[PDB]
Amino acid sequence: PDDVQLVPGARIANGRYRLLIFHGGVPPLQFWQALDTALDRQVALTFVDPQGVLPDDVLQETLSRTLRLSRIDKPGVARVLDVVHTRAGGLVVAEWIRGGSLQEVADTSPSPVGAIRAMQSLAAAADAAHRAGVALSIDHPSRVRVSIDGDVVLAYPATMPDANPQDDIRGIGASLYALLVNRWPLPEAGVRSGLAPAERDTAGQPIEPADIDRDIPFQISAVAARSVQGDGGIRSASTLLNLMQQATAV
Amino acid sequence: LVPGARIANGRYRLLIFHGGVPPLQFWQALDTALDRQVALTFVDPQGVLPDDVLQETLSRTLRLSRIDKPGVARVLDVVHTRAGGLVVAEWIRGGSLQEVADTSPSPVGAIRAMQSLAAAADAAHRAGVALSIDHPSRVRVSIDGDVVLAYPATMPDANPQDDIRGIGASLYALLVNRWPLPEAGVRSGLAPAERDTAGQPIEPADIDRDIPFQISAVAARSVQGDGGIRSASTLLNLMQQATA
């Protein structure tokens, strides 16, 4: 074979990373848990176009934009350890976050207040990213993990040319929604996350978190709704974090 | 090894020399692939080491890297290059120990910052590995206010008790801006501590009387091999009680 096929146990990038577990993804992206054979420690891998179907310009712009993301040190985004050109595609290597996927954590029905607190890191991270002029691209539940320390983190950074800052704001709200309601408010692509789509009202808008479970405080619900909505009116990650903090304070 | 040199297939570009304990060399470099700074420790650039000493250094360093603590910089790579054994770590934004020591920081801020390094030493010693804080340039002070080992490489000489002395020496430097231990290696960038009649470093509180005795004592008792603190766990506990 030209390129090493991706299966658990296989090694890629000059035999440096050993694949362990496939966590999903949205083509042309694959999220993997792997083992670095140089350091004997686990890393997150994001394969960009393993099959090399993309126009070269789109691949290069994804790696370059993701590199801009490599300068950001925040709890809310996995530290980028490296970005490599492979055989066909490219590879983003990040630190591994001990924890569980957004889906796994959402399924344990966390405290609404613990949820909103945990989300704050993701907003702060996105905001750092936007100031560096790059999106975090939270496009999908599988991008996200929650650390043992209670930080929501983008686990599998790759930023493709089409991703934009405003959709991160919606992604963050969607993730907050997932933790509150155990449902995903936004259209979902690629491999199924395990999150059942949210219930929608007559207008096709996701029903607010409190209207689902009333035990959830009124600002915590509002933050989620205004954030997920396209017209919701929260135009910056900095503003979103502040709103989150102001809701937690209550 | 000089500024501008290219290391590991051109990937890293040397910026600034931070000294070291020979054969080890600490370098601040540019990672030209990711366009970010990294910390580089060259284990034996001139190949004076017996292979077994090189291998042990790499092995113990790998052992150290699996400790996940704020007190040690993340190791990016450990690789045998054309320049010899090389340990690549993330860059800690901050200033060097020497730089911060020169600003005469709060004694309370200094001991607080030193906690992360002591906690890391404790964790590492439990794992059977030493930090090797042998030299002022080993550690940097992060913007977040933690003292962090910035240039991990652990040679066979490194041991838990010397870590304790190196950590105490570092705190000493922060308090009085002097190095309490006999000069080690090259480019330490610190004047020697003033010594008493027995040839021992003068306790910080005696040099500067605003240094609370407890804070002063942690430093003095860590540094002296006579009667001192024998564990990192105990060292950390003393640091915490002092700031309490």
Swiss-Prot record, chain A:
- State the post-translational modifications: Phosphorylated by PknB.
Tell me, what does this protein do in biology?
A: Essential for cell growth and peptidoglycan synthesis.
Q: Name the family.
A: In the N-terminal section; belongs to the MurJ/MviN family.
Q: Where is the signal peptide?
A: none
- What is the organism field in this record? Mycobacterium tuberculosis (strain CDC 1551 / Oshkosh)
Could you say which residues of the full protein are shown?
694 to 943 of 1184
Q: Where in the cell is it found?
A: Cell membrane
Q: What is this protein called?
A: Probable peptidoglycan biosynthesis protein MviN
Which superkingdom heads the taxonomic lineage of this protein's source? Bacteria
What does the subunit section of this Swiss-Prot or TrEMBL entry state? Homodimer.
Curated annotation (Swiss-Prot), chain B:
Superkingdom of origin? Bacteria
Cellular localisation: Cell membrane
Q: How is it modified after translation?
A: Phosphorylated by PknB.
Q: What does this protein do?
A: Essential for cell growth and peptidoglycan synthesis.
Family membership, please give it: In the N-terminal section; belongs to the MurJ/MviN family.
Q: How does it assemble?
A: Homodimer.
| Protein name, UniProt field | Probable peptidoglycan biosynthesis protein MviN
- Print the organism lineage: Bacteria, Bacillati, Actinomycetota, Actinomycetes, Mycobacteriales
